[PDB]
């Protein structure tokens, strides 16, 4: 079998995306953040506490046919970014794109931090990290790629996320007309639960590339791209204005400026982000200070390469016996 679905930025500034899944019988429809960064499958439900719900689509069970209570069951999840949520676990039957998993733990919010409620627009995450880091408890839970996985034409699912623009989540197969050029394949480790791998270095604008061993994760879920402080001055330096403010919480940059591209190696690949793709405009509205979309890591203990590295590029998530990264151009 395989699956297609688009995904689309929440906003202007593709701050997320969402992609429309179906769950239940009949089907509701909630539009989901997938996450690589992440291995629970969760969503805003008629459970969830009512003033912690202001905008989203509702999962709710007991309209489900096929919903069954996962007896016993509780999750709760805390992200990188501060956000959390938590509640019970149904299983039931969800769709993505065409491609049908009975059975999947889907694991419906009681509670939910501001910042979720206060986005209308994610009706809850879809986690396509390593089932190791689910958190059901007292009997974790597999993702909804792991499920599939042994159904799927080949074990892979990819993502090729637009900028400002529509995108795709496929899987079970991989579209050769969506890159350009060839895929190159880089090892990962699973030890952490994530799909972590190692950049071979990095260029800024037309600068030469240093080679370089950057660890990291390939992460949907995160929006920037972060990176050591290094890596991160070296770029900020060569945008004039540009500064790292402790009260706005990173890099800023006069809106006037065109921005440089930043090169990440893949092995003896060379993924290009254009300038244009770090600008995260003003800080707060009508500022002409602006946010910038490259970000140290110091202080997150990992580097992540989030959506806007990851949307300069067509990335295959190898889940063969032994799982590995792709890369291309597109």
Same mark, same amino acid.
């Given at each position: ?37 992440? &291995?629970?499958?969760? =969503?805003? #439900? @008629?459970? %969830?506490?009512? !003033?912690?719900? +202001? *905008? ?5 069970? /007991? ?44 694991? &419906?919010?009681?509670? =939910?931090? #501001? @910042?979720? %409620?206060?986005? !209308?627009?994610? +009706? *809850? ?5 390593? /089932? ?53 394949? %880089?090892?990962? !480790?699973?030890?952490? *639960? ?137």
């Amino acid at each position: 079998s395989t699956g297609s679905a688009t995904t689309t930025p929440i906003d202007s500034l593709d701050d997320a995306y969402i992609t429309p899944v179906q769950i239940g019988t009949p089907a509701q429809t909630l539009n989901l953040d997938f996450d690589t960064g992440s &291995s629970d499958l969760w =969503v805003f #439900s @008629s459970e %969830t506490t009512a !003033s912690e719900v +202001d *905008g989203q689509t509702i999962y709710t069970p /007991s309209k489900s046919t096929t919903a069954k209570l996962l007896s016993g069951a509780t999750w709760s999840i805390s992200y990188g970014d501060g956000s959390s949520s938590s509640g019970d676990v149904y299983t039931d039957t969800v769709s993505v794109g065409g491609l049908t998993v009975t059975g999947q733990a889907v694991e &419906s919010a009681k509670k =939910v931090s #501001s @910042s979720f %409620t206060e986005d !209308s627009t994610i +009706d *809850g995450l879809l986690g396509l990290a390593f /089932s190791t880091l689910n958190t059901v408890s007292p009997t974790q839970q597999k993702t909804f790629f792991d499920n599939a996985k042994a159904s799927l034409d080949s074990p892979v699912f990819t993502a090729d996320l637009g900028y400002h623009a529509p995108g795709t989540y496929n899987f079970g197969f991989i579209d050769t007309t969506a890159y350009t050029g060839s895929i190159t394949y %880089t090892a990962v !480790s699973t030890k952490q *639960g994530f799909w972590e791998w190692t950049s071979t270095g990095y260029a800024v604008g037309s600068g030469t590339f240093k080679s370089t061993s950057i660890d990291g994760i390939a992460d949907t879920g995160t929006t920037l791209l972060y990176l050591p402080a290094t890596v991160v001055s070296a770029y900020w330096a060569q945008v004039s204005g540009a500064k790292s403010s402790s009260s706005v919480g990173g890099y800023v940059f006069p809106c006037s400026a065109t921005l440089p591209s930043f090169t990440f190696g893949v092995g003896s690949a060379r993924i290009v982000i254009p300038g244009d793709y770090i600008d995260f405009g003003p800080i707060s509205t009508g500022s002409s200070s602006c946010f910038g979309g490259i970000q140290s890591s110091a202080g997150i203990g990992i580097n992540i390469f989030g959506d806007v590295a990851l949307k300069a590029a067509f990335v295959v998530f190898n889940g063969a016996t032994t799982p590995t990264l792709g890369f291309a151009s597109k």
